[PDB]
Design a protein around this ligand. Sequence first.
Ligand code: ISC
Ligand code: MG
Ligand code: MG
Length: 379
Amino acid sequence: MATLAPNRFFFMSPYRSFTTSGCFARFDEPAVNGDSPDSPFQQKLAALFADAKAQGIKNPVMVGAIPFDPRQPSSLYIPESWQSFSRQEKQASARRFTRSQSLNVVERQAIPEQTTFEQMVARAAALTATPQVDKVVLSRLIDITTDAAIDSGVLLERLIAQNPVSYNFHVPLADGGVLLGASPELLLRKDGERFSSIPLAGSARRQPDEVLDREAGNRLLASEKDRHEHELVTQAMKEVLRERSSELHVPSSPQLITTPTLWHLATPFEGKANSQENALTLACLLHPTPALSGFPHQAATQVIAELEPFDRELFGGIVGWCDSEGNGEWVVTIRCAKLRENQVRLFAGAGIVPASSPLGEWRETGVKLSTMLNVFGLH
Ligand SMILES: C=C(O[C@H]1C=CC=C(C(=O)O)[C@@H]1O)C(=O)O
Ligand SMILES: [Mg+2]
Ligand SMILES: [Mg+2]
């Protein structure tokens, strides 16, 4: 009953699921202007890829995470090797994994707490009613200190068991840490010439019984707050993708998708892109989406910087991989945690427009945090 070592990358996806071994070269280069092959980011990336193939490695991948603010340094690296696994096989082994960790929390801190958060929500809702911004997303944290170092392998087993369907990731950080999570949001898949993105925005709690549950979702489909929330996201990426895609299909209405925790509204984007493009050039172009920063992007970037009493770092960024041949997959870094020794930080954001109530968003972010609290066996 072996668990994953904290110095391995792991990625579980309906596209490609693999683990990695060892480390060839680290890659800290900021991803800013990564949507443009003339960028130092892409150049150094290309260099490092040719460097790696010249050095003997067949089929190099670049795995890891990129922070919310792409000016900041990146958590990417080429492993020595990688090894495919069966997503379904893994779901099954995880569900049978029995041996846990007795873990006692010695501190639990909400940052910020209910009252401050509600004022941040009120002050942001009001700025979206004005001409300055239409949508800002605001987040909060839960910091947890435990009395023994947290085994990240056992926790990954639990996360998979509780979240069989999501993009489940486990990434080694340059400090000795681990970024760990169960993301439902595809930011960018590129499979040959073909690409897709599946933005989410708008949520409703799921219910214990499949009658009051199957309508909670129907209600989400009707909800105008959430539908407007959602529309703000899709129009933005349409425009951005306009002169970057050969062809492009986007439904004008969202569809329901599930989390063990949440109903969300989704819009799948499908398209083809030029050979001038790769998984990262496209992922950099799209992220962050109005689902994670706001609209307009840079104007919401500033509200966020003045309201949030912390730095997001890797939270609200993207995690995934890309190869030397333009392929890859990138998911949004949400429903996640950073672990290092006996310290964990959880993250969740919403979801703010003129029609949002501060209690509403506080409790929403609450349900989103519970994906990762459940992995820890907390409430
Ligand atoms: C910022 C998060 O999720 C986005 C994804 C789906 C729905 C969202 C929402 O309804 O507000 C969020 O914008 C998070 O889970 O922390
Ligand atoms: Mg406005
Ligand atoms: Mg929301």
